[PDB]
Design a protein around this motif. Structure first.
Motif, short mmCIF file in Angstrom:
data_model
loop_
_atom_site.label_atom_id
_atom_site.label_comp_id
_atom_site.label_asym_id
_atom_site.label_seq_id
_atom_site.Cartn_x
_atom_site.Cartn_y
_atom_site.Cartn_z
N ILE C 67 0.82 -1.21 0.00
CA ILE C 67 0.00 0.00 0.00
C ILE C 67 0.86 1.27 0.00
N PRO C 68 0.72 2.12 -1.04
CA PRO C 68 1.41 3.40 -1.06
C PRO C 68 1.19 4.18 0.23
N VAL C 69 2.22 4.87 0.70
CA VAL C 69 2.17 5.50 2.02
C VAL C 69 1.06 6.55 2.16
N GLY C 70 0.86 7.36 1.12
CA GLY C 70 -0.12 8.46 1.18
C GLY C 70 -1.44 8.18 0.46
N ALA C 71 -1.79 6.90 0.31
CA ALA C 71 -2.89 6.48 -0.55
C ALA C 71 -4.19 7.24 -0.28
N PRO C 72 -4.66 8.04 -1.26
CA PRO C 72 -5.88 8.82 -1.05
C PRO C 72 -7.12 7.94 -1.05
N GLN D 87 -13.44 14.25 -3.20
CA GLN D 87 -13.25 13.79 -1.84
C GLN D 87 -13.69 14.85 -0.84
N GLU D 88 -14.36 15.89 -1.32
CA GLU D 88 -15.00 16.85 -0.43
C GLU D 88 -16.36 16.31 0.04
N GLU D 89 -16.94 15.39 -0.73
CA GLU D 89 -18.18 14.68 -0.35
C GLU D 89 -17.89 13.37 0.38
N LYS D 90 -16.73 12.77 0.11
CA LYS D 90 -16.36 11.50 0.73
C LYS D 90 -15.75 11.67 2.11
N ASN D 91 -15.51 12.91 2.52
CA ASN D 91 -15.17 13.20 3.91
C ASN D 91 -16.35 12.87 4.83
N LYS D 92 -17.56 12.88 4.26
CA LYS D 92 -18.75 12.44 4.99
C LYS D 92 -18.62 10.97 5.37
N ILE D 93 -18.22 10.13 4.42
CA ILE D 93 -18.03 8.69 4.68
C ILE D 93 -17.00 8.48 5.81
#
Lengths: 105, 105, 103, 105
Positions: C67-72, D87-93
């Motif tokens: 797993i990449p360290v900063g994985a978004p 990911q401004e909406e997935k901060n909800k998750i």
């Protein structure tokens, strides 16, 4: 509340194939011809029972007649489609609704 | 209906969100203490006038006390707390309902 | 890329039943000459076969190494309980997420 | 479970996003030409280097290939769609986190 019931009751009365008749609404509901009138003039504050008898004659339930205009609090949908769904799917909606609710608290 | 009124009254008493205690309900409604019981046991068919006054005493409208909660076509949720949502949040709830439906239909 | 996955090996090897000798981990791998030191230095690009036997003793599956360290794309959550919560009601999660895809 | 990445690559043939008609296959990673024979399964025990450069091409990463599809304890979601889409909406998750009330919890 009485005055809501009056308008609702009148609005349905102006619509519907039975046409309008305090007689026919009394006949359909099984209460006296003179009580409908007193209710439709918002003079007497009617009983929920009698309210139920009234809504049913039009194909509705009692609460439907005492809902404030704009209907804050009510949602748009087809009820069979909602009723026809699995129970496990329903608690998805209950879980979602209150999540939203208490996100705001 | 009267049996719905009773069920939700106790259901609203099971809540205790605003309520200090069981007892004070009669003068909040401003009607006899026999009455609240007669309603709670479905002895009498209550008028929509008092029904407003019982409900307004808690911060809900009348229709919510005779709403057929259990009815499968009807989502049990708190109408006041949905009313209070920013319409953006309301649209999103609506957005989900269709989601499930069109997923299942 | 392949390197920080070595740092995870070296990170884990410090606590298990066998937190010291390279060989006990080699037999945990099941294979490998004296070479298996080489996976710790990112000298070799270790095969996906190695992860498995290595993993079953650990209690960790294989993705946690690569797993990449900063994985978004990674969710924060206690997998204390997830599948452990009822499947009737774990179904909500998947539906909410997929709900957001259509958005 | 472990060979899940081999099938997951074979599962990607429905994507068709880059090239809409019959064409070579994929020269992106600079991996073997036999890989076509291989890709499906019964392949090779692939390197980390291999999958990482194939995944890099499409916009995926290493760890996501070898997560189980069938395993009980794995939350199924598309990490790149969890990355890519706002990911401004997935901060909800993420605020939703455990969310679970003691019914779930």
């Amino acid at each position: 509340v009485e005055k809501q019931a009056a308008a609702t009751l009148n609005a349905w009365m102006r619509k519907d194939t039975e046409m309008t008749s305090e007689k026919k609404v009394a006949v359909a509901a099984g209460i006296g011809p003179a009580t409908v009138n007193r209710i439709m003039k918002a003079e007497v504050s009617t009983t929920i029972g009698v309210l139920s008898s009234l809504a049913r004659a039009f194909g509705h339930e009692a609460y439907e007649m005492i809902i404030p205009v704009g209907a804050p609090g009510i949602i748009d949908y087809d009820h069979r489609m909602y009723a026809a769904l699995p129970q496990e799917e329903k608690n998805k909606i209950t879980s979602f609704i209150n999540f939203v609710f208490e996100q705001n608290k």
